[PDB]
Amino acid sequence: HKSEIAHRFNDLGEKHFKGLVLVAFSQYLQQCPFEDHVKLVNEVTEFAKKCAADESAENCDKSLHTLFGDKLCTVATLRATYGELADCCEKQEPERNECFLTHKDDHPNLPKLKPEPDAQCAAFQEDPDKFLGKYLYEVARRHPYFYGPELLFHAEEYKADFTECCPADDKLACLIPKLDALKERILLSSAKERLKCSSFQNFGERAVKAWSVARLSQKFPKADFAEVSKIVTDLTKVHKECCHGDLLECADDRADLAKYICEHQDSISGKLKACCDKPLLQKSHCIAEVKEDDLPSDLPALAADFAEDKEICKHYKDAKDVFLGTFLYEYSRRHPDYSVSLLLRIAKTYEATLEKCCAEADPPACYRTVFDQFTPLVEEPKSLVKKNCDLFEEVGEYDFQNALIVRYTKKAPQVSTPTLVEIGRTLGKVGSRCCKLPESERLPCSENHLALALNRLCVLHEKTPVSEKITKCCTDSLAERRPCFSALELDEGYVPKEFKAETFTFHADICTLPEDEKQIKKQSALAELVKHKPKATKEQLKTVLGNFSAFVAKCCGAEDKEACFAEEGPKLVASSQLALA
């Protein structure tokens, strides 16, 4: 064709086109006001309509990156507000776009979105388009790698939540539990896409492919290797584009893939029926979240092709990519009770066993026991999960989170306290989510979600690097990342942080906060306790923190709260140092 922007506008439709352009620009330029981004969207949209009418018109030929990039580079106060991005604007494509992506900010530290039911219902009623658009903008700048089409889907949930609750009597009671739930899905979804983009960035397209082979094989065990390979190839390109900033392209290709999967759902999975009986946005989303299908009764025995066959070395040499891909496909569809990363470690061990064995005198005898090399790899994460769920079920989320904050602060005491607490708390929510599930679903859930949390830590560490041990675990191997982190002990070369009384001094500020914000304050103190006394046991730390909790409960119950904190605080601060030796 002649004009890409015209083609995108026509296939996607104006609503979704404007939505995706608003998202795209909000992510690149995280600090600009909403009303001003709206004007850039409208200008770009006007251009697209003009081109759609005459594709031969001047500039309609230009690439989407060129058109979007030229637009962002016209923004008022560019050099003052976005000093780093103005530099990018001196460059031509595709350099300019690479430069833009370097400077996306994964921790922009904007205000937390606290919902104001009455004021929001008021702004929703007068102008839904403006209100719904504002939601896209606020989430996108807060999550600069968020999946464009996914955010449009979640914008529709947000709209439905307000459509249900704003006519009702009690607005705040209808709405808050729904918004709190939507927010949990925003956090999860955001972390999932970021891991995909992080994998492209730090490990390449092969790693993303392999991850997707394993996962889609688990979900769609009925599908044959050609079908899984096809979907993976397509899905990889979708996410590559969404991660490279090609949001229109990302959306068009996502829709095509959804159509393909739904045309071939008898061949792919019996669970897709519900998903495929829906409009576009909802269809793609249901497929991405779809439950794993039942194991086929005709799954083939694998020992003959992958352990007993005497020409495996020739198969490995003559067709490395396809023989290994077939193995991962076959083993993954067979194991929905394994984590994706476990499956990837198992494939890596398979490859290594063949490398070793095929260079020796008698290869068949050597690789005969290849499947028995997987056994210890399965045991380690199963033990880790049984152990952590036992602890969670005994002590509950708060104490489990604390235990993890201690565990991780010891691994990396150079990391900032807000980061350690964020990560420890996220790691702790894995228990709440995964330990309740059917027992065969715990390992996949647990490890898959730990991967998301560890990627967050790694992403933060790229920006703010403090620890060579974290660097190594985050960059050496995507499959080995969780076991790498687990194997880290107390960093012995860390110099204990100097004591500062104010760090451990509480005040009546704390009493008025909601529960989770009080917890974060206490959990920050705990982190700092570990930094001061890194060799102190988790049992010593739990006791000391308990004594701080008791102190806070008492003085928040006091008639004179300030005097209580002032009399009692310093004694507790002094005594705490002696309890952590």
Going by the annotation, the residues of the binding site for Zn(2+) are 65, 244, 246
C-beta of residue 341 within 8 angstroms of C-beta of residue 482: yes
Stretch that binds Zn ion, among 141-149, 387-395, 483-491, 532-540 (CB under 5 A): 141-149
Minimum CB distance to Zn ion, residue 285 (Å): 6
Give the total of residues touching Zn ion (CB under 5 A). Answer: 16
142 binds Zn ion (CB under 5 A): yes
Binding residues for Ca(2+): 4, 11, 241, 246, 249, 252, 256
Among 27, 189, 265, 401, binds Zn ion (CB under 5 A): 189
Minimum CB distance to Zn ion, residue 15 (Å): 8
Angle at 514 between CA 513 and CA 517, to 5 degrees: 75
Peptide bond before residue 94 is cis, with ω within 30 degrees of 0:
yes
Nearer to Zn ion (CB atom), residue 485 or residue 504: 504
C-beta of residue 57 within 8 angstroms of C-beta of residue 50: yes
Among 141, 196, 335, 442, binds Zn ion (CB under 5 A): 335
Minimum CB distance to Zn ion, residue 272 (Å): 17
Element (H, E) at 433: helix 417-434
CA-CA-CA-CA torsion sign (369, 371, 375, 381): positive
Query: Which residue type sits at 241?
Result: E
Among 273, 436, 507, 535, binds Zn ion (CB under 5 A): 507
Please return the burial class of 49, using the count of CB atoms within 10 Å of its CB with bins 0-12, 13-18 and 19+: middle
Minimum CB distance to Zn ion, residue 480 (Å): 20
Nearer to Zn ion (CB atom), residue 330 or residue 485: 330
Distances (CA, A) of 557 to 434, 517, 521, 548, 562: 36, 18, 18, 14, 11
C-beta of residue 354 within 8 angstroms of C-beta of residue 316: yes
Nearer to Zn ion (CB atom), residue 472 or residue 507: 507
User: Footprint of Zn ion on residues 240-259 (CB under 5 A)?
Assistant: 244, 246, 252
Per-residue mark of binding to Zn ion, 40-59 (x: CB under 5 A)? ---------------x----
| Residue linked to tokens 């004009």 | 3
11 binds Zn ion (CB under 5 A): yes
462 binds Zn ion (CB under 5 A): no
Minimum CB distance to Zn ion, residue 367 (Å): 12
Per-residue mark of binding to Zn ion, 283-322 (x: CB under 5 A)? --------------------------x-x-----------
| Distance from the Cα of residue 93 to its chain's centroid | 29
Minimum CB distance to Zn ion, residue 396 (Å): 25
Other beta carbons within 10 angstroms of residue 87's beta carbon come to 13
Minimum CB distance to Zn ion, residue 266 (Å): 25
Other beta carbons within 10 angstroms of residue 214's beta carbon come to 28
Contacts of 79 (CB under 8 A, 6+ apart): 86
192 binds Zn ion (CB under 5 A): no
User: What distance in Å separates the CA atoms of residue 450 and residue 199, rounded to the nearest whole number?
Assistant: 15
Stretch that binds Zn ion, among 125-133, 322-330, 335-343, 458-466 (CB under 5 A): 335-343
Minimum CB distance to Zn ion, residue 293 (Å): 15
Per-residue mark of binding to Zn ion, 197-236 (x: CB under 5 A)? ----------------------------------------
User: Footprint of Zn ion on residues 522-561 (CB under 5 A)?
Assistant: none
Contacts of 473 (CB under 8 A, 6+ apart): 458, 481, 484, 485, 488
Contacts of 115 (CB under 8 A, 6+ apart): 175, 176, 179
User: What distance in Å separates the CA atoms of residue 423 and residue 425, rounded to the nearest whole number?
Assistant: 5
Other beta carbons within 10 angstroms of residue 490's beta carbon come to 13
User: What distance in Å separates the CA atoms of residue 349 and residue 465, rounded to the nearest whole number?
Assistant: 31
Minimum CB distance to Zn ion, residue 36 (Å): 21
Minimum CB distance to Zn ion, residue 458 (Å): 19
Among 16, 96, 141, 345, binds Zn ion (CB under 5 A): 16
Minimum CB distance to Zn ion, residue 29 (Å): 17
Rg of the chain over all Cα atoms, to the nearest angstrom: 27
Stretch that binds Zn ion, among 10-18, 79-87, 227-235, 535-543 (CB under 5 A): 10-18
Minimum CB distance to Zn ion, residue 218 (Å): 10
341 binds Zn ion (CB under 5 A): no
Minimum CB distance to Zn ion, residue 407 (Å): 26
Nearer to Zn ion (CB atom), residue 125 or residue 233: 233
Binding residues for Cu cation: 1
DSSP string, 180-237: HHHHHHHHHHHHHHHHHHHHHHHH-HHHHHHHHHHHHHHH-TTS-HHHHHHHHHHHHH
C-beta of residue 253 within 8 angstroms of C-beta of residue 365: no
| Distance from the Cα of residue 154 to its chain's centroid | 16
Please return the burial class of 48, using the count of CB atoms within 10 Å of its CB with bins 0-12, 13-18 and 19+: buried
Q: Tell me the two tokens of residue 442.
A: 């715990």
Stretch that binds Zn ion, among 100-108, 137-145, 229-237, 560-568 (CB under 5 A): 137-145
Nearer to Zn ion (CB atom), residue 351 or residue 441: 441
337 binds Zn ion (CB under 5 A): yes
Binding residues: 1, 4, 11, 65, 241, 244, 246, 249, 252, 256
Nearer to Zn ion (CB atom), residue 100 or residue 400: 100
Among 509, 516, 562, 567, binds Zn ion (CB under 5 A): 509
C-beta of residue 175 within 8 angstroms of C-beta of residue 117: yes
112 binds Zn ion (CB under 5 A): no
Nearer to Zn ion (CB atom), residue 157 or residue 491: 157
Q: Helices (H), strands (E): how many in the chain? A: 30, 0
Question: Which residues bind to Zn ion, rule: CB under 5 A?
Answer: 1-2, 11, 16, 55, 142, 189, 244, 246, 252, 309, 311, 335, 337, 507, 509
